[PDB]
Design a protein around this ligand. Structure first.
Ligand code: SF4
Ligand code: F3S
Ligand SMILES: [Mg+2]
Ligand SMILES: [S]
Ligand SMILES: [S]
Lengths: 537, 262
């Protein structure tokens, strides 16, 4: 793995191809990263804005936490209010919510891999040097969806016209221009991935369209209430057929294009199986069974905690063990449990190393944990999940890797693909189950009042990991409302013991081939799929 | 040769960038390879850090000039320090760049009017672009919604590239997309007029598709083209049985709440 002998700092600000505004500072010694700080650089304050309002409106405000992970926050707020009301949720609301969420996973992960992460591995200019006939044969050898020499030649020509124009647009100043020792793939592999990048730009439109069939629109869905869902049209055969036709198409693209490209890329970057590992993992599980909304263990995959990579010893998840530190964050006070959370800003200066981020540092029972697809897939593995354990075993077999390779930037990236695949296939069953349930069950919503005094918490394991919303209601209004969001966990700063958060820790040991072109920092940070609108809110 | 477009993100949720990605007249790949040159966009651009900053400066001090699309509000509280990029406050960055643009388009309710972070009690003293840079002679075209329809965003841009006439309403919005209320365009208007209302979501009236006014719909106060052009070529909130929350209206967070009442 190439590496310089650079000793000194490196700052990446803006760290692009993420959502939101992130600054990364690292210290390097001998071309190896020894220390890292994650700096979230925008605050908005949605928790404070929510105080005093009608709990029914919370979901509409919190959905504006983030539009990449659109819907997720509406779902978590609705789940939160429904926990506080603690009355039965219609089975069809669960079904339709689960289906829309599965479609969100398919969309989000597809766009992350191609349009936010791939340029860290794919040299677009190297694609211009490819033999289009060789690229077709490479493409055809890894997928049942076939291509011709002419189609790949056509892609190269359009690309050539673009680059020759000198207006490189979003590829301007790319780290791979002029060559970079950190980029390993051959031109034919580069052209295959580049062609698919472009196809996926159109494909994602159709994937997203699927959420609009029941959920009104994408982005920012508008079909949920505390008590169920509002889309009576989702009961009609015409909407169900449309949803199914789009799902099938979305599934095919994932199975035939994304997943083999991810495997192609992993096959060139096996050394990254030894870079950016972490030890502890936390997942909240997802996709409750009908009747099971209040029980995390009813979920298609279950929550769990894993310490020191002991996957065979998954521990229970106890929400009361969640606390958020602020010692190194721009807020006042000390660590708090979210029902007692506080968000009083305390800014120092940009570039400070004492207090350096608008992200709180959440800790589980005092430990630093990673959340997200890798976390949830390891927890599932340890729970012997019916499709996730064999799927993981098969990936490792394909790439000829040991399980130790899971605990890395490569494994993190692979796990995002695996989660996409298993959810995409399970959707078929949920859809059939929903369609069979509505034969007799025509209910989609119950009319419930907001209680005068109560508390609830909503949980979701979404694209980037464990999301939770925590509300106390007094006098029928929002007393306190706190969000604890996946990227809060992964991209938080150090805690009150000085212990870094997952991403900060993962960056330790990263080799840097060119301090002026830190593709390696980006590879690892992008593998966590950070959203800073989410993490800070 | 292709016209230069700079896209900036201030205080936003990236909903507008995602909407843009849903464009289908034309598709986004067509737009950035053929129709425009997208020279800066933090969500998809290759470069980071100093290389990104250099790309941005090249674009802004470029020959043919550039069009600026800005997403999000400007946080001005605490000497503009609630929002930084590359060690500069967001205020300072837009104060520098927005006057250099041949034109500015405010995309999303936040860049237009302040949006979610400006809602009471507005912890960061967030301001929409025209509020914030009035004094600089900046006069953006407002394309609101939360997020806006890609048909309105791209449509506004395309009309400008065509040297077309873009009439604005009293709060800066293209009348070609925002000239009528949602309610006037609504397929359930016959029920409204007939006095046929759903009293609750679990009711027969809602099941038969009656008007949502009594469960909060703000359609009559809200200007946008949602029932006519649809989202994702296929649906909109009221057709999905949920009231309009008036998301293309100034201060809707505070003026249209509570959402489930009129
Ligand atoms: S559902 Fe809303 S927009 Fe439609 S007729 Fe009723 S009040 Fe007007
Ligand atoms: S909520 Fe917004 S998207 Fe249209 S239907 Fe109302 S203006
Ligand atoms: Mg929080
Ligand atoms: S998600
Ligand atoms: S607003």
């Amino acid at each position: 793995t190439p590496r310089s002998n650079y000793t000194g700092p490196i700052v990446v600000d803006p760290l692009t191809r993420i959502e939101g505004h992130l600054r990364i500072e690292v210290e390097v010694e001998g071309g190896v990263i020894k220390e890292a700080r994650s700096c979230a650089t925008l605050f908005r304050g949605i928790e404070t804005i929510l105080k005093g309002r009608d709990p029914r409106d919370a979901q509409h405000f919190t959905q504006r936490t983030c539009g990449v992970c659109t819907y997720t926050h509406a779902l978590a707020s609705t789940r939160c209010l429904e926990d506080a009301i603690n009355k039965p949720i219609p089975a069809n609301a669960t079904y339709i919510r689960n289906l829309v969420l599965g479609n969100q996973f398919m969309h989000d992960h597809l766009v992350h891999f191609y349009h936010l992460h791939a340029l860290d591995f794919v040299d677009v200019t190297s694609a211009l040097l490819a033999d289009p006939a060789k690229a077709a044969k490479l493409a055809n050898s890894i997928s049942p969806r076939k291509a011709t020499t002419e189609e790949f030649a056509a892609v190269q020509a359009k690309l050539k016209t673009f680059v020759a124009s000198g207006q490189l647009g979003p590829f301007t100043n790319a780290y791979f221009l002029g060559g970079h020792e950190g980029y390993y793939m051959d031109p034919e592999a580069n052209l295959v991935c580049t062609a698919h990048y472009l196809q996926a730009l159109r494909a994602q439109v159709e994937v997203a369209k699927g959420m609009a069939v029941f959920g009104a629109k994408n982005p920012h869905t508008q079909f949920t209430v505390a008590g169920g869902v509002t889309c009576y049209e989702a009961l009609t055969p015409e909407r169900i057929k449309q949803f199914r036709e789009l799902y099938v198409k979305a599934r095919a693209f994932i199975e035939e294009v994304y997943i083999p490209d991810l495997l192609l890329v992993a096959s060139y970057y096996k050394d990254w199986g030894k870079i950016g590992g972490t030890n502890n993992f936390m997942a909240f599980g997802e996709f409750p069974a009908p009747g099971g909304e209040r029980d995390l263990n009813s979920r298609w995959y279950k929550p769990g905690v894993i310490y020191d990579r002991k996957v065979g010893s998954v521990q229970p998840f106890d929400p009361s063990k969640i606390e958020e530190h602020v010692r190194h964050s721009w807020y006042e006070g000390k660590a708090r449990a979210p029902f007692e959370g506080e968000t009083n800003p305390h800014f120092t200066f940009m570039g400070d190393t004492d207090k350096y981020s608008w992200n709180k540092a959440p800790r589980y029972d005092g430990h630093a944990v990673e959340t997200g697809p890798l976390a949830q897939m390891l927890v599932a593995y340890g729970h012997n999940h019916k499709t996730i354990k064999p799927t993981i075993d098969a990936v490792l077999g394909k790439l000829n890797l040991g399980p130790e390779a899971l605990f890395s930037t490569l494994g993190r990236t692979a796990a995002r693909g695996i989660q996409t695949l298993v959810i995409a296939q399970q959707m078929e069953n949920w859809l059939n189950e929903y369609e069979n349930n509505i034969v007799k069950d025509k209910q989609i919503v119950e009319d419930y009042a907001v209680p005068t005094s109560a508390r609830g918490v909503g949980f979701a394991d979404v694209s980037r990991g464990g999301l939770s919303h925590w509300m106390t209601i007094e006098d029928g209004k929002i007393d306190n409302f706190q969000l604890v969001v996946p990227t809060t966990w992964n991209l938080g700063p150090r805690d009150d013991k000085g212990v870094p958060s997952a991403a900060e820790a993962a960056l330790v040991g990263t080799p840097v081939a060119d301090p002026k072109r830190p593709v390696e920092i980006l590879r690892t940070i992008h593998s966590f799929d950070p959203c800073i609108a989410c993490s800070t809110h | 040769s292709r016209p230069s477009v700079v896209y900036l993100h201030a205080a936003e949720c990236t909903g507008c960038s995602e909407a843009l990605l849903r464009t289908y007249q034309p598709f986004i790949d067509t737009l950035i390879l053929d129709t425009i040159s997208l020279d800066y966009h933090e969500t998809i651009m290759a470069a980071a850090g100093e290389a990104a900053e250099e790309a941005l400066q090249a674009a802004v001090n470029g020959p043919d000039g550039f069009i600026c699309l800005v997403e999000g509000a400007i946080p001005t509280g605490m000497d503009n320090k609630y929002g930084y990029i590359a060690g500069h406050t967001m205020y300072d960055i837009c104060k520098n760049i927005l006057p250099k643009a041949k034109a500015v388009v405010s995309i999303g309710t936040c860049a237009c009017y302040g949006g979610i972070q400006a809602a009471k009690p507005n912890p960061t003293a967030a301001k929409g672009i025209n509020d914030c840079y009035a004094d600089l002679g900046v006069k953006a075209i407002n394309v609101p919604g939360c997020p806006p329809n890609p048909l309105n965003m791209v449509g506004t841009l395309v009309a400008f590239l065509k040297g077309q006439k873009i009439e604005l309403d009293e709060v800066g919005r293209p009348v070609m997309f925002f000239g009528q209320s949602v309610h006037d365009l609504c397929e359930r208007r016959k029920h409204f007029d007939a006095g046929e209302f759903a009293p609750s979501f679990n009711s027969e009236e809602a099941r038969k598709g009656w008007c949502l006014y009594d469960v909060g719909c703000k359609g009559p106060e809200t200007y946008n083209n949602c029932p006519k052009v649809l989202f994702n070529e296929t649906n909109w909130p009221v057709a999905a049985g949920h009231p309009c929350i008036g998301c293309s209206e100034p201060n809707f967070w505070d003026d249209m709440t509570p959402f489930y009442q009129n």
